[PDB]
Amino acid sequence: MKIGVFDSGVGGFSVLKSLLKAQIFDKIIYYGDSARVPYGTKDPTTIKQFGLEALDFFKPHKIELLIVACNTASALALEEMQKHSKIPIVGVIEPSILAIKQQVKDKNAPILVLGTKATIQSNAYDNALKQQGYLNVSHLATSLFVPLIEENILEGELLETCMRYYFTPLEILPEVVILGCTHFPLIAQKIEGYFMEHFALSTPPLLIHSGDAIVEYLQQKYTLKKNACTFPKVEFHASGDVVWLEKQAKEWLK
Amino acid sequence: MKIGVFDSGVGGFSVLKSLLKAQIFDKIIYYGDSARVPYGTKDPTTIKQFGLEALDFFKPHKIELLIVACNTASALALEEMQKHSKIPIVGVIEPSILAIKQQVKDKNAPILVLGTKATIQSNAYDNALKQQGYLNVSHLATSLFVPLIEENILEGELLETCMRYYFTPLEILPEVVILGCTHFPLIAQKIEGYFMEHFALSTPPLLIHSGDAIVEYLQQKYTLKKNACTFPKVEFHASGDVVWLEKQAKEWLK
Ligand SMILES: N[C@H](CCC(=O)O)C(=O)O
Numbered sequence: 001m002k003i004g005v006f007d008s009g010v011g012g013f014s015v016l017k018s019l020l021k022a023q024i025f026d027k028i029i030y031y032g033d034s035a036r037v038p039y040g041t042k043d044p045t046t047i048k049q050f051g052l053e054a055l056d057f058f059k060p061h062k063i064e065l066l067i068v069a070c071n072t073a074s075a076l077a078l079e080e081m082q083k084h085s086k087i088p089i090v091g092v093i094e095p096s097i098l099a100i101k102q103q104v105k106d107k108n109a110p111i112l113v114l115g116t117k118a119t120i121q122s123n124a125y126d127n128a129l130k131q132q133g134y135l136n137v138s139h140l141a142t143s144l145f146v147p148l149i150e151e152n153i154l155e156g157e158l159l160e161t162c163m164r165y166y167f168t169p170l171e172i173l174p175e176v177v178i179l180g181c182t183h184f185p186l187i188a189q190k191i192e193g194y195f196m197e198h199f200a201l202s203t204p205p206l207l208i209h210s211g212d213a214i215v216e217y218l219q220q221k222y223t224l225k226k227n228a229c230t231f232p233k234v235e236f237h238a239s240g241d242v243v244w245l246e247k248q249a250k251e252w253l254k
Numbered sequence: 255m256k257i258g259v260f261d262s263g264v265g266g267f268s269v270l271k272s273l274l275k276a277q278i279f280d281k282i283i284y285y286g287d288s289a290r291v292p293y294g295t296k297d298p299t300t301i302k303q304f305g306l307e308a309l310d311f312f313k314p315h316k317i318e319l320l321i322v323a324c325n326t327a328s329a330l331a332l333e334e335m336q337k338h339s340k341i342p343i344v345g346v347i348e349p350s351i352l353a354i355k356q357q358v359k360d361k362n363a364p365i366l367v368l369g370t371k372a373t374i375q376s377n378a379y380d381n382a383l384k385q386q387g388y389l390n391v392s393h394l395a396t397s398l399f400v401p402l403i404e405e406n407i408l409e410g411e412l413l414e415t416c417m418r419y420y421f422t423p424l425e426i427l428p429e430v431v432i433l434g435c436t437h438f439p440l441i442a443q444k445i446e447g448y449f450m451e452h453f454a455l456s457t458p459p460l461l462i463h464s465g466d467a468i469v470e471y472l473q474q475k476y477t478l479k480k481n482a483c484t485f486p487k488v489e490f491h492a493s494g495d496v497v498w499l500e501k502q503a504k505e506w507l508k
């Protein structure tokens with residue numbers, strides 16, 4: 001299939017990375033809305049409209065499946081996009097719920113959901129987890145991780161202080177942490193290192209990566225063999241400067 | 255007299271606050287492009303197009319003067335906006351140069367410009383300063399101040415760590431710090447405090463507030479009577495959820 005990948009900006013490169021490593025698709029058209037990014041600090045009406053405009057972008061490109069790599073667009077706009085599309089649209093929330101069902105059999109394990117403000121206020125993850133019977137779920141909007149990560153603050157005292165800022169109030173020590181944002185895989189080890197240090201743990205909590213979860217969902221749903229497509233055609237498109245977005249792709253994808 | 259104030263979002267309330275305090279205008283139409291904020295991390299082509307589109311927003315409003323409160327749009331889009339406009343457009347860069355001309359007679363005084371990445375990259379402040387003979391000029395993009403301030407992080411260790419991140423390499427004590435971004439007034443005293451601590455001063459550098467500069471500039475250019483309009487009509491418009499933007503106004507204007 002010819003696939004589209006939509007994100008608000010460059011964050012979706014963490015999903016594209018998972019897709020590319022799996023070698024499942026031969027043609028991928030990436031579109032990042034880099035003129036208007038971030039979505040996570042904005043309101044549901046604005047985001048829903050952005051999702052619908054992403055469909056208009058892809059319509060002339062005759063894609064067969066659209067991945068919404070953005071957890072924020074997945075949380076707020078996916079249902080409206082799906083109603084307006086004749087092709088399947090797969091977001092990054094449900095695949096992570098499926099991944100949890102498969103990897104977390106104890107329905108009382110403390111799960112911590114991390115995302116943008118918009119993602120967390122939508123309760124998309126809370127509702128879906130409760131529907132599957134999970135009972136011990138906390139959510140946390142770690143808004144400032146996004147701009148720190150885009151400024152390449154992936155280590156150091158600034159990142160640690162920002163983690164302290166958001167994590168210190170936590171009541172429950174999570175056993176599972178959902179990276180419900182495109183950006184957060186880039187600090188996954190730091191988040192693991194946080195909870196091991198400040199809680200004297202031997203093993204980190206289990207982290208759920210949205211890109212890895214959607215690869216697995218897509219392999220199951222569409223019966224897609226891995227390592228089948230070694231030299232895919234990948235095209236990059238952007239609402240802001242595409243050269244800027246391609247330079248970021250080089251960094252995020254290598 | 256009926257004016258417009260244009261900003262990427264809510265940062266422009268720092269300028270509106272200055273305008274209201276002066277009580278010189280009767281009718282103010284504020285427009286924040288809150289669907290697309292920020293501008294500071296984006297590219298010149300995009301920002302220029304955002305500026306031209308702002309002119310379209312104000313057409314039905316019959317304004318007689320447009321203030322570009324945004325330092326980023328001022329640095330990148332002002333000239334094109336002015337070329338396409340039948341009304342005067344006033345940005346926040348030139349009024350701050352005038353404030354320096356008037357307050358800083360020693361042309362060798364060291365000046366530090368703070369702003370978004372786009373503002374600093376444009377060199378608009380350095381070029382304007384050179385035009386008046388100020389050649390001892392340094393500049394620093396302090397990108398993360400914008401999202402910190404929008405998250406209401408105006409004090410405490412997270413802000414101090416962020417200031418340390420940007421300021422620790424500074425070796426030249428500035429005599430003047432230009433707050434070349436709508437948001438930076440909300441942490442002005444913290445910036446003053448930092449320099450006093452870091453350079454061991456008994457008195458901080460002089461800070462140039464963009465909003466106060468443009469008010470003074472406008473008072474001189476149009477010979478407006480301060481404290482004339484005590485009960486102005488103020489309208490808020492936004493590309494995102496205007497209720498969200500008005501709520502922020504309440505906080506910023508208090
Ligand atoms: N792509 C977004 C993060 C950046 C944004 O806020 O737009 C997400 O996955 O939530």
Ligand SMILES: N[C@H](CCC(=O)O)C(=O)O
Binds near residue numbers: 265266293327
């Ligand atoms: N209003 C912008 C700050 C926020 C943004 O980057 O849009 C400025 O004055 O530079």
